[PDB]
Design a protein around this ligand. Structure first.
Ligand SMILES: Cc1ncc(COP(=O)(O)O)c(CN)c1O
Ligand SMILES: Cc1ncc(COP(=O)(O)O)c(CN)c1O
Ligand SMILES: [Ca+2]
Ligand SMILES: [Ca+2]
Ligand SMILES: [Ca+2]
Ligand SMILES: [Ca+2]
Lengths: 396, 407
C-alpha cells in the first residue's frame, strides 16, 4: 500500500521499454569515456580515505573545481560550500529542488515536450503541473531545425498566476535538441521577475551545442541569479552516465533548502567517484583554450555524428529535425495507444532498429500534436552508426 | 522560503560537529583499510566502458543477484533479486524510500530512544508523528556494564501502539548503544506489529558486527513478519567502504514496489562501477562464508579485540563504558569525572559541553549521546558519550597516549 504522495506515480516510461537489434533509443553512450576519467577512478580506488565518507554537500575538491569552472562561465565568485550542492545525478538535483522549494498547491510551469521526470516530481510534491507546448515556425525552406520550434510569449504569460512557484527550463532541450536563444530566456526572465517565481534550469547538455548556437545560462540574465537553480551532470559532461553525479548551483538562500532535502534523504554522495571527477575537471579546466579540452572535442566529434544521422534519416524518407545541441535527433515519421509507440514496435521487429516515441515526453492533451515524432540517440561509436547505415541502406 | 515539508529540519547534528592534532573517535569514519579485493574490483570496473554507463534503476543485475544469494541463505528462503530488493544510495536512502513510499501525513511511527538521528526528521518530512519510547537500563550482573543491560518495557511499548501506528523503526545492532536485540525482544515487537497490523522498518546495517555471546536475529524471519517488514543493509558497513554509499532494502514484493516508486521519481539509479565492484566483493565472500577468512567473520573478530581495548582505556580514566554486544561504537558515562565545565554558559546538554571540553583540553573528540535523543529524552541520556573503535592500531595508540597522560 503506497503513501498518498506516490499515488499514480508507479508507472515509468523507461520501466516499459533481442541482442541483434541496434539500439538508438535510451541515452546510453557506447563511445569510451576519456581515458583519464577511468584512470582517475582507478587511482581513487586505491586511496583508503577516498573509500570513506566525504563532505555531505559535496567532496571539497569537487565543489572547488565546480566553483572555479562555473565562476568563469558566470563571471562571478561562486561560494563552493554555500552556492553548490552535489547530488545523485541531475535527477537528484531536480528532486532536491522540487522537494525543498515547492509546496502542495503550487503551480509549476513545464514546457512540452518535457524530459519525463518533471511531471511526477511536481506531482509528488503535491504541486500542479501547468503545461505549455513548444510550437513550430515556418522553416527557412532549406532544412528543418530545432530553432524552428519556439514558444508564444503571450501564451507563456497566461500560464503565470499568483499560484506559480516556478518554471522548469531545459536547455539544450531533450528531446528536441533546442538551444534556447537569449531572447527566449529574456521572456522567461521577465516573467519570473514580474511574478517573483523560481526558475529551475536543467542544463546537463550545456557543453553539447553545435555550430551557429551558444549556450546561454538564464541565471546570468539581470535579476535571475537570485531566483535560479541551474543543474549540471557528470554523466553528460564526461560521458559517464553510470556515475550518477550532478550539481545545483545558485544563491545560498535557495541552495540551503536543497541542502536540507539532501541531509534528510541520502546525505552523502560517493567519495571515489567525486575524487576522480574533481581530477577529471582540473585536467580539462586547465586547457579550456585548446581543442583537446573535452568540453571542446566532444561537441566537435558529435556534430559530425549528428550530420551523419541527418543524412541517414533523410536517405529513407524520415524528416529529421536538425538539433542545435544535445545528442538526440527527432524524425518525423508520417511520410512513410499513440502512433509513435506503434511505429517504434514496428521498426524494432521489422527493421532491427530501436528508438523512443516523442509522445512519452508529452502530457496527455499534447500527445496528438507530437505522436508522429520519434527520437534517435547518436552518442554512439562509428561501428554502431555503421550498423545503423546497414539497416538504413537495406530499408527498402 | 523552504517548502513546508522541511520546516525545522534544517538543523543536523553532523553539520553541527563541523584541527590535525586531535584524535577523532567521534564520527563512524573507518581508518582501517577496506579489503584489498574491494579496492581492486572498483579499479577493474573503472576500465570497463560499460560499467561506467547507466545500469538497471532498482539495482545492478549482478549486485541484486549476489544480494539475493547471500540473504536467501540467511533468511532460508528464496529472495527475488528484482522484486524483493531495492538498491539505494546507502542505508540513508533505503530509510528514505521506506518512509516516503509507506508513511502518510498524520501516521504515527514508533521510534526507540536513543535513535540514529535521521529517523526523527525522516518521519517529520513525511508529515508523520514520531512516537518515542526510551530504552531503559536494568541491574547489571555486577562485573561488567553491557548493552544487554539495556531493554524496553513491553507494557510501555504496547501503550505506544494505537489505530494510528503505521510503523515501528527497529535498529539492531543498535547505534549508539551497541545493543543486539534478543529473540524475546523481537517477539514482543512482532506480536504488536501483527496485533495492530503495522509495518516494521528494520535498520540492520551492523548485522555482521556481533560479538561473542550474541547472535544477530532478523525480525523479518519471525512468524507473520515477512509480509510486514523492510530490512535494510549497507555496503559501507559490510565492506568498510562508507564512501561507496550503497544500501539495500529487502522485503515482500507488495512493499518493495512502493520503495521502488519513490526511487524512480527521486534519484533513479545508483552508480554502476560501485555496484559492479560490490557484486564481485560479495561473490568473493559469499563463496567462503564458513571460513575464518571470510570478511563477514574476520571483521567482527578483529573489532572484538579493539572493543575490549577501548573498554580498558575508558576504565583507566574513570569513564564507565557500556560494553557493546555489537557494532563499532561504545558509550561511556562521563559523570564520575565531575569535569571543569563551570563556564561554558550555553543551554546545551551536559554531554555536548563535555565533548567540547575533552576536545580542547585532552585532544580527543567523541559524540554526545543526546544527539540521538528527542527533546524530552535528552536529560535522561546527557551524561553519556559515544566513542568509535573501527580504527587502526596506531589511532588507538594515540588515544591510549591521551588516556595515560590524563592526570
Ligand atoms: C534533460 C535531462 N535531465 C536530467 C537527466 C538525468 O541526469 P543524471 O543522469 O545526471 O541523473 C537526463 C538523462 N540523460 C536528461 O536528458
Ligand atoms: C544505524 C545506522 N543506519 C544507517 C546509517 C547510514 O548508512 P549509509 O552510510 O549506508 O547511508 C548509519 C551510519 N553509519 C547508521 O549508524
Ligand atoms: Ca507571485
Ligand atoms: Ca523556516
Ligand atoms: Ca521467489
Ligand atoms: Ca492498525
Amino acid at each position: 500500500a503506497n503513501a498518498k504522495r506516490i499515488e499514480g506515480l508507479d508507472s515509468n516510461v523507461w520501466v516499459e521499454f533481442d541482442p541483434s537489434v541496434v539500439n538508438l533509443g535510451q541515452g546510453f553512450p557506447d563511445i569510451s569515456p576519456p581515458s583519464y576519467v577511468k584512470e582517475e577512478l582507478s587511482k581513487a580506488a586505491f586511496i583508503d580515505n577516498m573509500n570513506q565518507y566525504t563532505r555531505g554537500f559535496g567532496h571539497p575538491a569537487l565543489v572547488k573545481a565546480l566553483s572555479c569552472l562555473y565562476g568563469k562561465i558566470y563571471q562571478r565568485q561562486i561560494d563552493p560550500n554555500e552556492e553548490i550542492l552535489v547530488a545523485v545525478g541531475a535527477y537528484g538535483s531536480l528532486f532536491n529542488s522540487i522537494q525543498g522549494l515547492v509546496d502542495p498547491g503550487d503551480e509549476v510551469i513545464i514546457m512540452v515536450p518535457f524530459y519525463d521526470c518533471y511531471e511526477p516530481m511536481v506531482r509528488m510534491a503535491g504541486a500542479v503541473p501547468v503545461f505549455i507546448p513548444l510550437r513550430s515556425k515556418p522553416t527557412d525552406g532549406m532544412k528543418w531545425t530545432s530553432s524552428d520550434w519556439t514558444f508564444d510569449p503571450r501564451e507563456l504569460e497566461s500560464k503565470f498566476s499568483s499560484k506559480t512557484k516556478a518554471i522548469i527550463l531545459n536547455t539544450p532541450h531533450n528531446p528536441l535538441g533546442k538551444v534556447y536563444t537569449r531572447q527566449e530566456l529574456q521572456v522567461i526572465a521577465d516573467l519570473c521577475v514580474k511574478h517573483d517565481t523560481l526558475c529551475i534550469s536543467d542544463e546537463v547538455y550545456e557543453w553539447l551545442v553545435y555550430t551557429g548556437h551558444t549556450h546561454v545560462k538564464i541565471a546570468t540574465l539581470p535579476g535571475m541569479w537570485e531566483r535560479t537553480i541551474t543543474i549540471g551532470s557528470a554523466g553528460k559532461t564526461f560521458s559517464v552516465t553510470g556515475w550518477k553525479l550532478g550539481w545545483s548551483i545558485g544563491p545560498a538562500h535557495l541552495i540551503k533548502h536543497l541542502q536540507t532535502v539532501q541531509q534528510n534523504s541520502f546525505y552523502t554522495c560517493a567519495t571515489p567517484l567525486q575524487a576522480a571527477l574533481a581530477e577529471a575537471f582540473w585536467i580539462d579546466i586547465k586547457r579550456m583554450d585548446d581543442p583537446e579540452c573535452y568540453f571542446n572535442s566532444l561537441p566537435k566529434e558529435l556534430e559530425v555524428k549528428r550530420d551523419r544521422m541527418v543524412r541517414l534519416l533523410n536517405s529513407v524518407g524520415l524528416k529529421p529535425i536538425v538539433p542545435d545541441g544535445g545528442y538526440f535527433i527527432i524524425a518525423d515519421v508520417s511520410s512513410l495507444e499513440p502512433y509513435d509507440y506503434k511505429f517504434v514496435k514496428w521498426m524494432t521487429k521489422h527493421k532491427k532498429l530501436t528508438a523512443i516515441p516523442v509522445s512519452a515526453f508529452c502530457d496527455s492533451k499534447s500527445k496528438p500534436h507530437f505522436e508522429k515524432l520519434v527520437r534517435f540517440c547518436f552518442i554512439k561509436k562509428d561501428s554502431t552508426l555503421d550498423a545503423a547505415e546497414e539497416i538504413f541502406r537495406a530499408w527498402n
